Amino acid sequence: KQYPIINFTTAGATVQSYTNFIRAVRGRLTTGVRHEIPVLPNRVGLPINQRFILVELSNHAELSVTLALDVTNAYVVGYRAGNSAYFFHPDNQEDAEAITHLFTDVQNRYTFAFGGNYDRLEQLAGNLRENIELGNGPLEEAISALYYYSTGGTQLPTLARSFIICIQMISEAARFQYIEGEMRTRIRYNRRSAPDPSVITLENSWGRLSTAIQESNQGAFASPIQLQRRNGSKFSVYDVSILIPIIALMVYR
């Protein structure tokens, strides 16, 4: 029994082909409703045969990697390249026991010393999110860099930067329609550009926005959380109705 697999390729990717890809990622993630915003499945009690989904990516050089996405928080937990599989360091032993059920066929299994969170990947990559280009070009380059890590051809700083690109255009593009729209604009005009402060702010606030929405009374927040306009200037929202077209998935709380 294999997990659900989603196929996307950067070779000739259009605005529509990438939209259908992200729309497919949201579908497999929200299989397990009534809420106006879909709520990701609960970690406790979730049987392992529905704990993950696989997102395989290819590029113009026909190089392929498969990313493993947890379904409770839509985060990449590891990836397989050829005959090897790589996993971030798990948070507890329950998650360490869950990851031995993916890629049960590879010959080489490795667990990194570090977690997959952004601030760690930015230290490893030697660059911040505001300095890492996003787009189809940066994604095609990442895919080649993920695989060639299995052959010793990619060093760790390039691998960490490649994770930052992939996590933003798959995981963050699923969570927020706003971020997916930002990626679709880069594909539309064939331009690579780093995320503006309105995007980093949403990525860091996903857990905090997931808090205020499920804990909202009639849709009103208890305390206002603050977002950023694209010019860096800040504001504050107080209810769910302004974020409905903005956020698509929420971790359970």
Ligand SMILES: CC1(C)Cc2cc(C(=O)O)sc2-c2ccccc21
């Ligand atoms: C932060 C985010 C997602 C992005 C954004 C960027 C704006 C600008 O270009 O000034 S406004 C605005 C906005 C408004 C209402 C809810 C959410 C947002």
Ligand SMILES: [Cl-]
């Ligand atoms: Cl570490």
